[PDB]
């Protein structure tokens, strides 16, 4: 039957990508032996993966569309349908299954035709999200109030929706809306979860507001002891960036989030899912660094590889069912030569996470305007989840005010409270996000919403 | 797809060393620890391409209880440097984990060139990739590493010393009886017509490895299916299950098969394989057939009498005599005889592969002999070696060339102990050096005459065996008539006088005359020809009176 | 731009191979599952550069209803390195993903030159990665490989061994019959002329290929235009309907076309073709006809006596004589009759092919010969051979060097049961050696005597058969004239006589008569020169009493 | 610095082979439309050193209306691995966007040598990028190709076969008249005494 890349489904954004060649337009340049409608070695338009381009806009790795238009030619092309060759390969470093030599599975059975490759950790070429902008300090304000009053470390998610970045070439950016928490038993330095019980749940709201989870967040922020909000400098080039620890538990949840892909032969590449730690600067200010795993560095969490050392800097390789081959890194010396060192036992933590950008609007107009509730699992800080609120919150004792349900952390409350049917509740995420005048004039007639109107004029 | 020793045939003798060297140690690595000997871990294949080399493989492998590895050449060299070389860690360690294990690895030649003669230091890593993990295993490891090859002189030699890679093994061309075993591995598969005779195929096929076979296996299938293409509609999705049942191949289309381009073989190389002609079929010229009995037989029957007399023979024998005297078959007779192997090598053959130079293959050729011993060595067209500097009078350059040069010291470094025999055979003997001629290399010269009416009767008799000749046929008086001819000329009165029957056979058809008439005979007999000049048997008949004074 | 099976034209017994190693395992797998055979997966296309190579793949490839991939030679290495390796990877995981499937390949040889000759490890790992990637497919998979290439030797042989490349599959240049049809394909899409004779061109057309033809098509268009250019402005954006309509391209477009610098085709080679001068084109000698008649017309008509009489032929026939004795024409003339194929090979283009060291292609003739059975192997100018040393007498060397030790062997290396024959041809044969004579190899030797004024009379009927001769003329009488004239001389008397009619004809028109008058003969009748000494025929007459001596 | 026709003088029959080549095929495609021919792309210059072969080529591409797009065979390989191959691909992307265009290589030889006698797989890639991307081309694109070298035979001759390159177009020694029309155009631009 078909292909995955024939079945599967881009998303509306990778609509919107692949008809674009991304190409930058040169005017005559320098050497120009033409007309001002010839050509020359130096008036061509230029290339999306064009390196000395990416170079002089300082530009760190090309897009993933920017390396897809670089690796493949334009004629290989799924509109073609049948005769495409998907031009991305997802990695499979776990083991060769249906070996085609007479030898068993994998285990019993070992030959050439069934091991896979020994793994050359580069940098890795490209990232999947360019920009993360955060659509409101709002947001951010909002969700670093547990660390101002407890100064213990703190994870959320990352929810919101991908649109183009036109700064840097093909650029997506990752728009961030709204944060929602499992239960977790929080420490300092690191933290352990509870096992999360909502799933459909919040993801349904998500599905209601048209987000999804689009990555994941978490703060180091350690306040540096003289009472400004500065940190000890501990993400930086002398110390480290990322704690291998959270580099093997964020590929948990990115192999828990792949992206489905019309270019790739399993039908899905790479992973929607991001990466943001909140920390702070040089400068003393409450700094963020956005990252994600690259694509061995999700395979060799799901093909069990490597491991956290003592040194946050230092990934152990896995001593000895499975197969642990070579692992190298390129380097460059100080005369530019590129030596793969043997990376057994061990090796640096660079060659695993790409860098992204972060950022605001230039005015805040997200979906989501208001803020008014009392945040999930923080019994600990008497921060609690109970009906009461609503009577202030919606404000519906006070019968006559508006819809104050523009608080992405209140709609899975009141998804919480899961008074409002699938589509009455669509019909309040479809106001809780736009906000139309006589659609909220439907919703405050419709029954449910009344419903929901004369349930809660009637508590305490 | 899974071998067992059934699928394989014909080179029994090549299983029984491997069994010896392979499934001996495995099953009971106890014999070795008793006896206190070293397991060889060098067990070497080689041989012509496509001679089941990797199919002798499995068929060792499927029949242990072993661990199996399989390694590929070129799958090796596919891979990217320095993970290439990981692979042949990762290989020998998870046979030193599963300890009664066996590695074979496909064409050796491929990961594994001359470090001399070859290019890039990726090829030369793995090769020390290899050099470095062969040696790193154990005895108490009990891993044995396979390995084969089609270029067994391609290879590093370091590999082939002593630790690595000790067990020479070959898998020469098989028999006609051992290769009909092989076309009846292929044909019990197939659905056969009950005309098939297989031994008439084996019998008339006589330099193919096993491939070749399958491909004429595979060659009359379709020609019988070529047969049923009116019946086979290919518009159609499905043929019907009638046809199905019809396609039976048939004998014809081996006949058809044998003499399509299948049967083109690899026989260009330096081969051994033992003869088929016999005395009988040589007339005449019996006291240098009992010279024979007694310079070369004698040897190779009974080495006990000179370690009573403790004296070694003399090993080098040459033929001489006037052309087309029938010397080609007299080393094949004599091989054919006392079961010895037998190497064909012909002047221009030398040659011919030293424009390509293939001189490693001449020391095979004494190698290989040394493998098969018992075994003579058969130089054909001496001549030719004076001729490729085209004589002693020649370009002003002698029989002396390389050649010459390569091949006394390769007779020279021949055990006197060993049965590897040498036999040369020239019809110019004069053109020869008397280095090549020196006592020690080639003492022993045997002058070839015409034979004599006797003689000229005993060839007609045994040339005509085969043939439905008359019966009004004098051959004496054909004897009597020719007395200057050669055999060779005798041989050609009876292709001019068949030509002549076939001048009467299908001119018949066209205007079965199974028989050769004196009308026949007495065109050609009025046709004969001699081809050979008595005063140049003047000659060699004062070489046969003295060529010692040289 | 998407080909079916009418767009290829005029090698139809290779396509006819190519649906029986293509279409037919796709479309019913079920015949190789019910005859229990496996189906071949190693179709090899190769040839001549620019004849259809890449045409007749999609042409077999859009012709199944199977999934057709491709992969162009020079497109894998345009590639980085790993990448490059990559992309076979991912085409075979298709293939087999898409089960009816048809890999071409284009332009093998670029990815997969020789192993041994090569620098780059890049290439290296290529060929590795092919080599490995052959032997992984499987008979389930029902996947077809099909590879092209113009040069077929500087393949690595691993892929030609068996289990990856069995089937070669040679495309041979069209015969004037195909090619006609080529010109039928090209031209049905052109606007013609009615003058348009395509089977005057055909015919006229003699060693191209159809690329050569695609071009001749596309010369004469382009001259049709030239015609047109002076109604055509080239300052105007768009030329008129009116001169697209007269736009029909004469034959004279092609007559102008035809000594255009297209015709210079690509017949450097070791070519395969049907000769077309016939017997009675060949007058006299009639005693040697039938020994041709029966040397070599018997076998490759009836090898059905040789069985019943047990007696294989001989293959080896040797031409001799003086110069100039359309010896030729003689093979050429039987391999018309009898249908066989024939390969013309000159002296020099083995020396020439050997400057540039072409000696694979010398077993090439011998093997294209075993494809082309029956073919029969003409060797024109032994004496060449002998001349590549001067002579026999020459540069002190004879006639041995690298091509006869070469040829000794390929001869040699020839099976009897074949019915592939070998003519040889030289007019100094005193100074040929004999090991080339050898029985086995040519020891069928025939004298071609000048003719006597019977022959020269039915020389000069043969002769004349195309010329407008005048009704005056006594042949005989220039017969009686004409003693110690050769069958050359003979031709160069007309050749004289033309020129001198050519010295009356233009002359005329200066200041038709197609005649060719006494006047213009007896003219070059007193200009006749003999060019063969009696002394010289007194050499080989005494080589015609007695050669055998040797 | 632009030539026209009267900049270039002498081998006028050459010149009248390559209006028919590429003058011909780009004001009017319908000529070969009309008639059903494929458009010759595989125009090949070549002569002797130093003899207008460059001069030629602008002496027809400023001629016509056609876009025009120049390749140097030292820049090429000037360039660095990959990038090089990376030039070639935005060659002709931007020809069979400007359909009625020009592309002439200047020193084909200098990308293109024998893949027999070379060294460098980076000189067997960009031979390689070359042969895969002129079959990539359409005769719907309209787009000519054009090459001129002064070593014809050091090229590797599968550019030189069938639906690459078969025009080869020899740009001879001239006469003693076509030597003095050279003469007259550089000479129209000096000032000389009236001796001349
Ligand atoms: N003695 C034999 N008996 C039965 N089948 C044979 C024999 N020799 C060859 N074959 C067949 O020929 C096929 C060719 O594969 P192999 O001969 O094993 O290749 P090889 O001999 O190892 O030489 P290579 O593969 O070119 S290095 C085998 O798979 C068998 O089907
Ligand atoms: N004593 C013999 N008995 C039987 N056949 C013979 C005898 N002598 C010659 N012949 C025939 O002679 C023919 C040619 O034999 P050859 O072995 O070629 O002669 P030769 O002595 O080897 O010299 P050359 O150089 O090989 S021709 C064959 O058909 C033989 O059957
Ligand atoms: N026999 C033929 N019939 C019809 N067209 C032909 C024939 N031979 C050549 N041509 C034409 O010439 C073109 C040359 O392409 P191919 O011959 O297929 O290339 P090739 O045969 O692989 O030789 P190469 O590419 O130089 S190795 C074809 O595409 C046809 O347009
Ligand atoms: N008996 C003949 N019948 C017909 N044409 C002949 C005859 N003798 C010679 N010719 C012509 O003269 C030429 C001789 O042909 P060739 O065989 O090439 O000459 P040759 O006898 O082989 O000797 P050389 O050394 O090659 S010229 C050809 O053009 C023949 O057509
Ligand atoms: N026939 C000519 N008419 C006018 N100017 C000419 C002629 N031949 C050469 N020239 C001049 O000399 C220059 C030669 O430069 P090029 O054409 O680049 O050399 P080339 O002919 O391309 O051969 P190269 O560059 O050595 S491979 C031209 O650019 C003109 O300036
Ligand atoms: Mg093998
Ligand atoms: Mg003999
Ligand atoms: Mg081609
Ligand atoms: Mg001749
Ligand atoms: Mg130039
Ligand atoms: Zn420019
Ligand atoms: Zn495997």
């Not at chain 1, 994941?216 to 501990?234: E, F, P, Q, R």
């Not at chain 2, 010397?327 to 010895?340: G, S």
């Not at chain 2, 006394?408 to 049965?419: A, F």
């Not at chain 2, 006592?439 to 004599?452: K, W």
């Amino acid at each position: 039957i078909k292909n995955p890349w024939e079945v599967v489904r881009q998303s509306p954004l990778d609509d919107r990508l692949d008809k674009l060649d991304g190409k930058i337009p040169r005017k005559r340049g320098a050497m120009c032996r033409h007309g001002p409608k010839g050509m020359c070695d130096y008036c061509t338009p230029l290339d999306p993966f064009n390196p000395q381009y990416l170079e002089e806009k300082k530009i760190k790795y090309m897009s993933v569309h920017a390396y897809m238009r670089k690796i493949n030619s334009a004629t290989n092309r799924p509109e073609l349908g049948s005769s495409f060759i998907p031009p991305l390969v997802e990695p499979y470093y776990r083991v060769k299954r249906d070996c085609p030599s007479g030898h068993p599975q994998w285990p019993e059975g070992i030959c050439t035709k069934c091991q896979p490759s020994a793994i050359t950790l580069q940098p890795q070429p490209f990232r999947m999200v360019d920009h993360v902008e955060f659509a409101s300090p709002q947001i951010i304000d909002r969700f670093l109030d547990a660390w101002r009053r407890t100064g213990v470390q703190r994870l959320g998610i990352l929810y919101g929706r991908y649109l183009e970045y036109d700064a840097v070439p093909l650029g997506i950016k990752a728009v961030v809306e709204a944060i929602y928490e499992p239960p977790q038993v929080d420490e300092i330095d690191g933290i352990t979860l509870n096992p999360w019980e909502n799933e459909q749940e919040v993801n349904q709201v998500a599905k209601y507001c048209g987000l999804e989870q689009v990555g994941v967040i978490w703060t180091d922020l350690l306040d540096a002891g003289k009472g400004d909000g500065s940190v000890v400098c501990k993400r930086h080039a002398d110390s480290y960036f990322l704690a291998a620890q959270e580099i093997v538990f964020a590929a948990r949840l990115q192999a828990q989030h792949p992206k489905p892909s019309k270019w790739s032969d399993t039908g899905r590449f790479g992973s929607n899912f991001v990466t943001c730690v909140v920390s702070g600067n040089e400068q003393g200010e409450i700094s963020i660094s956005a990252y994600q795993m690259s694509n061995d560095a999700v395979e060799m969490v799901r093909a069990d590889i490597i491991e956290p050392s003592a040194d946050p800097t230092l990934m152990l390789v896995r001593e000895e069912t499975r197969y642990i081959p070579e692992v190298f890194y390129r380097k460059i010396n100080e005369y530019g030569a590129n030596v793969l060192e043997n990376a057994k036992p061990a090796f640096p933590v660079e060659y695993l996470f790409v860098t992204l950008t972060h950022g605001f609007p230039d005015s805040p107009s997200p979906l989501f305007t208001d803020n008014i509730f009392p945040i999930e699992n923080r019994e600990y800080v008497g921060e609690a989840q109970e009906v009461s609120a609503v009577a202030k919150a919606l404000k519906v004792h006070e019968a006559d005010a508006p819809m104050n349900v523009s608080d992405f952390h209140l709609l899975c409350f009141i998804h919480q409270m899961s008074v409002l049917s699938k589509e009455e509740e669509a019909l309040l995420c479809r106001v809780a996000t736009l906000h139309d005048l006589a659609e909220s004039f439907q919703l405050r007639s419709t029954t449910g919403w009344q419903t929901l109107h004369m349930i809660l004029q009637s508590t305490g | 797809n899974e071998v067992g020793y059934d699928d394989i045939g014909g080179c029994r003798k090549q299983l029984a060393q491997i069994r010896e060297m392979v499934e001996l140690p495995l099953r009971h690595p106890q014999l070795f620890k008793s006896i206190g000997i070293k397991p060889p871990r060098g067990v070497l294949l080689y041989g012509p391409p496509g001679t089941g080399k990797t199919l002798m493989a499995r068929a060792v492998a499927n029949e242990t209880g072993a661990f199996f590895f399989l390694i590929n050449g070129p799958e090796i060299m596919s891979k990217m440097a320095g993970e290439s070389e990981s692979n042949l860690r990762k290989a020998f360690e998870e046979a030193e984990k599963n300890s009664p294990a066996i590695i074979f690895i496909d064409e050796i030649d491929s990961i594994a060139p001359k470090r001399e003669k070859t290019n890039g230091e990726v090829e030369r890593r793995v090769v020390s990739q290899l050099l470095t993990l062969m040696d790193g295993m154990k005895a108490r490891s009990n891993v044995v590493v396979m390995a084969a090859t089609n270029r067994p002189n391609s290879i590093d030699p370091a590999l082939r010393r002593f630790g690595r890679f000790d067990r020479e093994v070959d898998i020469g061309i098989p028999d006609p009886t051992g290769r009909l075993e092989i076309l009846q591995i292929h044909t019990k598969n197939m659905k056969l017509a009950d005309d098939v005779d297989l031994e008439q195929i084996a019998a008339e096929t006589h330099g193919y490895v096993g491939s070749d076979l399958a491909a004429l296996c595979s060659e009359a299938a379709m020609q019988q299916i070529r047969e049923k293409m009116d019946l086979i509609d290919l518009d159609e999705d499905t043929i019907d299950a009638e046809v199905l049942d019809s396609l039976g191949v048939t004998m014809d289309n081996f006949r058809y098969a044998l003499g399509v381009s299948n049967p083109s073989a690899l026989r260009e190389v330096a081969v051994v394989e033992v003869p088929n002609v016999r005395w009988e079929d040589i007339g005449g010229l019996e006291q240098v057939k009992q010279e024979l009995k007694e310079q070369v037989q004698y040897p190779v029957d009974h080495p006990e009498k000179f370690l009573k007399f403790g004296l070694s023979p003399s090993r080098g024998v040459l033929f001489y005599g006037p052309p087309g005297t029938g010397k080609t078959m007299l080393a094949k007779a004599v091989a054919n005889e006392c079961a010895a192997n037998f190497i064909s090598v012909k002047g221009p053959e030398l040659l011919s592969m030293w424009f390509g130079e293939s001189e490693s293959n001449i020391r095979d050729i004494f190698d290989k002999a040394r493998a098969a011993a018992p075994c003579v060595v058969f130089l054909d067209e001496l001549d030719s070696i004076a001729k490729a500097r085209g004589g002693s009078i020649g370009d002003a350059g002698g029989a002396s060339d390389r050649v010459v040069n390569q091949l006394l010291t390769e007779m020279d470094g021949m055990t006197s102990k060993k049965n590897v025999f040498v036999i040369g055979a020239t019809n110019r003997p004069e053109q020869l050096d008397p280095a090549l001629c020196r006592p020690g290399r080639l003492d022993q010269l045997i002058y070839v005459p015409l034979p004599d009416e006797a003689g000229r009767l005993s060839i007609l008799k045994a040339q005509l065996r085969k043939t439905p000749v008359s019966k009004d046929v004098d051959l004496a008086y054909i004897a009597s008539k020719t007395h200057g001819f050669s055999g060779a000329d005798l041989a050609f009165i009876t292709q001019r006088a068949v030509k002549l029957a076939i001048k009467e056979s299908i001119a018949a058809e066209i205007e079965p005359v199974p028989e050769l008439t004196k009308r026949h005979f007495e065109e050609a007999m009025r046709d004969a020809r001699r081809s050979v000049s008595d005063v140049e048997i003047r000659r060699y008949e004062a070489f046969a009176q003295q060529m010692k004074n040289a």
